[PDB]
Design an enzyme around this catalytic site. Structure first.
Site, PDB file in Angstrom:
ATOM      1  N   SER A   1       0.841  -1.180   0.000  1.00  0.00           N
ATOM      2  CA  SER A   1       0.000   0.000   0.000  1.00  0.00           C
ATOM      3  C   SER A   1       0.888   1.246   0.000  1.00  0.00           C
ATOM      4  O   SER A   1       0.479   2.302  -0.465  1.00  0.00           O
ATOM      5  CB  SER A   1      -0.901  -0.002   1.236  1.00  0.00           C
ATOM      6  OG  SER A   1      -1.506  -1.255   1.494  1.00  0.00           O
TER       7      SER A   1
ATOM      8  N   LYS B   1      -6.931   2.809   9.857  1.00  0.00           N
ATOM      9  CA  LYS B   1      -6.109   3.773   9.132  1.00  0.00           C
ATOM     10  C   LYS B   1      -6.775   5.144   9.127  1.00  0.00           C
ATOM     11  O   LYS B   1      -6.118   6.156   9.391  1.00  0.00           O
ATOM     12  CB  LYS B   1      -5.881   3.329   7.676  1.00  0.00           C
ATOM     13  CG  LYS B   1      -4.859   2.219   7.389  1.00  0.00           C
ATOM     14  CD  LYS B   1      -4.609   2.135   5.858  1.00  0.00           C
ATOM     15  CE  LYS B   1      -3.798   0.914   5.417  1.00  0.00           C
ATOM     16  NZ  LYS B   1      -3.553   0.864   3.944  1.00  0.00           N
TER      17      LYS B   1
END
Lengths: 100, 50
Positions: A46, A89
């Site tokens: 990511s 996140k």
């Protein structure tokens, strides 16, 4: 991360010759790089789009636009693929006030 | 099944399923035009030692 790192090195080379042919930075210029540790390896792809954003940012020398952060995997073509754990996140990102 | 993917039968623990094996180049081949290096694979999908 070595896979994401060199895949990003190549695609950054490819993107530079694709977009600004006169420039020859990524195709020929030595670059030491460092990525902070701490994240789980599964989400580390990511970060690869961030890696490219850094490499190209130094390439052109243009500072990245302020107050934004991006995350995503790359497959030497620039397409992004899903990454998990988004609920944690987004909250931890919001605590720092990042808005983009 | 565009190339590098294909359906493949699997005898799961109960019944069977058409698991699609996926394959793709993962890092560009052209580390050097003169380079002799092998294409080492990085398996995934809960690899066993055997």
């Amino acid at each position: 991360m070595k896979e994401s790192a060199r895949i990003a090195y190549t695609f950054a080379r490819a993107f530079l010759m694709q977009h600004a042919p006169a420039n020859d930075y990524l195709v020929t210029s030595h670059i030491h790089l460092h990525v902070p540790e701490g994240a789980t390896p599964k989400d580390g792809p990511s970060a690869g789009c961030t890696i490219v954003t850094a490499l190209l940012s130094l390439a052109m020398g243009r500072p990245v636009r302020q107050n934004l952060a991006m995350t995503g995997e790359v497959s030497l073509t620039g397409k992004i693929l899903p990454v998990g754990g988004i609920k944690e996140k987004t909250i931890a990102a919001k605590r720092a006030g990042v808005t983009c | 099944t565009p190339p590098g993917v294909v359906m493949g039968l699997a005898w799961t623990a109960m019944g069977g399923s058409t698991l699609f094996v996926e394959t793709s180049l993962r890092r560009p081949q052209d580390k050097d035009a003169k380079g002799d290096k092998d294409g080492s694979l990085e398996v995934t999908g809960q690899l066993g030692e055997v």
